[PDB]
Amino acid sequence: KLPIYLDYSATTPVDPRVAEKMMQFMTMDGTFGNPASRSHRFGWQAEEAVDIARNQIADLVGADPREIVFTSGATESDNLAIKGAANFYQKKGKHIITSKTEHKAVLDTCRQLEREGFEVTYLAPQRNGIIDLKELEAAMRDDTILVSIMHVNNEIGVVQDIAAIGEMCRARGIIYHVDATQSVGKLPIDLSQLKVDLMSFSGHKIYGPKGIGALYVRRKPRVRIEAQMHGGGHERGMRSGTLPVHQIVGMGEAYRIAKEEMATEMERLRGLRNRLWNGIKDIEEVYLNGDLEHGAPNILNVSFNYVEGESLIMALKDLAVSSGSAEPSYVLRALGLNDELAHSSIRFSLGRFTTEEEIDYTIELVRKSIGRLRDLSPLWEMYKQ
Amino acid sequence: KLPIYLDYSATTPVDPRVAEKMMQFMTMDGTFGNPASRSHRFGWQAEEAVDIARNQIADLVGADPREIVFTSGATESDNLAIKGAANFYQKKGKHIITSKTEHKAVLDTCRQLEREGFEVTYLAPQRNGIIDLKELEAAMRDDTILVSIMHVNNEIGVVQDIAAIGEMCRARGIIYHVDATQSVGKLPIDLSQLKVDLMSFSGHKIYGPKGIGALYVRRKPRVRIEAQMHGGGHERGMRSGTLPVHQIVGMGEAYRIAKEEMATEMERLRGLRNRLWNGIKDIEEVYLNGDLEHGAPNILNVSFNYVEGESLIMALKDLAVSSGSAEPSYVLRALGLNDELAHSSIRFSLGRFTTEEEIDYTIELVRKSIGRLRDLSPLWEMYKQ
Ligand SMILES: *Cc1c(COP(=O)(O)O)cnc(C)c1O
Numbered sequence A, B: 001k002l003p004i005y006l007d008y009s010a011t012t013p014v015d016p017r018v019a020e021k022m023m024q025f026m027t028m029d030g031t032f033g034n035p036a037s038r039s040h041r042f043g044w045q046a047e048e049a050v051d052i053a054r055n056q057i058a059d060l061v062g063a064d065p066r067e068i069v070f071t072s073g074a075t076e077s078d079n080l081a082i083k084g085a086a087n088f089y090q091k092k093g094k095h096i097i098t099s100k101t102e103h104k105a106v107l108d109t110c111r112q113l114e115r116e117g118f119e120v121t122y123l124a125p126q127r128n129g130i131i132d133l134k135e136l137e138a139a140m141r142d143d144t145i146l147v148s149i150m151h152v153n154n155e156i157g158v159v160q161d162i163a164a165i166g167e168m169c170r171a172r173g174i175i176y177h178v179d180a181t182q183s184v185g186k187l188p189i190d191l192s193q194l195k196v197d198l199m200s201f202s203g204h205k206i207y208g209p210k211g212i213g214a215l216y217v218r219r220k221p222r223v224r225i226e227a228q229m230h231g232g233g234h235e236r237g238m239r240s241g242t243l244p245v246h247q248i249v250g251m252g253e254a255y256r257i258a259k260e261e262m263a264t265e266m267e268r269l270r271g272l273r274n275r276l277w278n279g280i281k282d283i284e285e286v287y288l289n290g291d292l293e294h295g296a297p298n299i300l301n302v303s304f305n306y307v308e309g310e311s312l313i314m315a316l317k318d319l320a321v322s323s324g325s326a327e328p329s330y331v332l333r334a335l336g337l338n339d340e341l342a343h344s345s346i347r348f349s350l351g352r353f354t355t356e357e358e359i360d361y362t363i364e365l366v367r368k369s370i371g372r373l374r375d376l377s378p379l380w381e382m383y384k385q
């Protein structure tokens, strides 16, 4: 029992196998060396471990290891890719197009670039979170140098057609960046086919450790960015600093694991997700945010009408979930939900350790909770005539 | 025996206690929560651990927890403090003063600011590595907004009078940043007294894990910087991104340990360092780069004259050390050493697990190895008339 964790999108637990691998690269009896120490064995062994992990990450997304730049997380990756490309190609233009539902790491980076003189078009998504590709194309100009649209949304799990957006960008000579923190290891990614130029990844959203991530930077056709972190020109000049070996080994192991169990795990999560939805879609006034069909298999975001969101989370004390509110979720607001519905919205994000028992328990707890509140709810009183 | 590790300045092993604390914040059965998840217990517990570590770090350096900003390492801390303060106060001036012997994270950051329109004065150190404060003083102008001089040099261990430098800066209203990555936990630091406004710290140089660090940002008199990492306004708007709890717990425990054992360990290292130098200082043409009495108690950088540096490292294969070459060390070159002598220089850095047994073995190996090299050395032949 205990507080059931259904907030995997916020962060996931490190896989035991990842944890045990990481432990081998920390203490004095392990490979604790600095890979930058080129004159001795401690460094050589550390460097080898990094290369193995860099290849493991690359294998998952069908990339060349040299295209993988290590960062401290997907936030830095997002900052590096957008600020990096925006600054590098600014002579070609200063227009950037993105989406209003992007993660803050993308939105706040674009806001900073706006104060630096760049122009940013924040596209509004359709009611279901999907970006109208026609509007995207209409927004593109001769001075547009970059587009950033995420693969899977962290709040509602909607999936964008990154392959198609990439096509549109390559044809116009526009750099395309994808924040794939919520899709890597869940949805198939093959950059040998995909026309994406920059792609952000993280470790802790796929059972790896927090504080590590990577940025895919296409080698062919060659894409370039200005490093945002200086001090040695590490990572082929794109990101300076000491390589956190144990963190890097953990991310690699996490990505090796994902490649192998992805197919079976995702089909499993999709089943638990539908199970959850089927068990509550019948509740009087409930709305699903996104698309329980093409969206991510592990995310379920639903709004419960005629209930004070302020007390919803308290009602669901037995569940560790999220509402998105910081002010209500800006993603839900971008979808068109009013402040009240947005507040009384819950995101259920499933993971590797979620079971049917938990789901059925959750289904029950939700129906009952929504039932009680609605009884002693002045708002619901209003609904029923 | 095996390759004796005398490269503690490049990186240190994670202390066993640090490693065991970290392991409790990774897997499903431990505190794996995202501290940013404010609606449930997994988040709350993680937040508590972070706050505990933030205090442990602040206590070592005499700061307030609120002045500690978490970063991915000292490289990022250096980037954040300098780019952050430069951009924030640019309307008051764009002149920055630093030292030619600073770590690359400071130098390459200053180089980037230069192409962005900032003016940087790189002061040359004295023969012994000390910055002549009168020269620093003469370089300060009314439009000088920032100074960055490190506490302990990573290559030669020389110590700068940061207290006096801080006084000079505060009196002129200049922001003073100190890269204290090699001094924290080794030399006493009390920010409640020290007139330093920004200070960089790392974890893996003081037996903590790689990939984690912090930036001290003075609260009173209030100092401010522009964030370089966007996405949520975390760390009081100064550094966005997920807080890597297991990493932060580790740095905290590492700083807790350093506060407790600093006095006893530093005296021990000073003894071993002195033991090493005494055993080789009598070798024909050997020179100590830095200062034997005031320099850091764990770093010994020596040059061996009239000997090809190319064979030096190999000859000392039984030791894991560094020559600081990339091209010879730029620090040594800044001290006035010719390219050849700089190349034939070795940096010995000691730590928590170094023993007198290792030092004595090192002494013998150095003497014998240097004698053998000089036996067949064309350079030595020239010298011997
Ligand atoms: C979590 C997340 C990020 C930020 O990840 P980092 O590793 O945590 O800092 C960025 N984008 C998306 C879509 C995310 O879910």
Ligand SMILES: *Cc1c(COP(=O)(O)O)cnc(C)c1O
Pocket: A241, A242, B009, B072, B073, B074, B075, B076, B078, B103, B105, B150, B152, B153, B154, B179, B180, B181, B182, B202, B203, B204, B205, B211, B212, B213
């Ligand atoms: C190692 C070091 C740095 C960089 O440290 P990070 O944790 O490794 O990236 C900066 N300054 C000094 C003086 C150092 O010794």
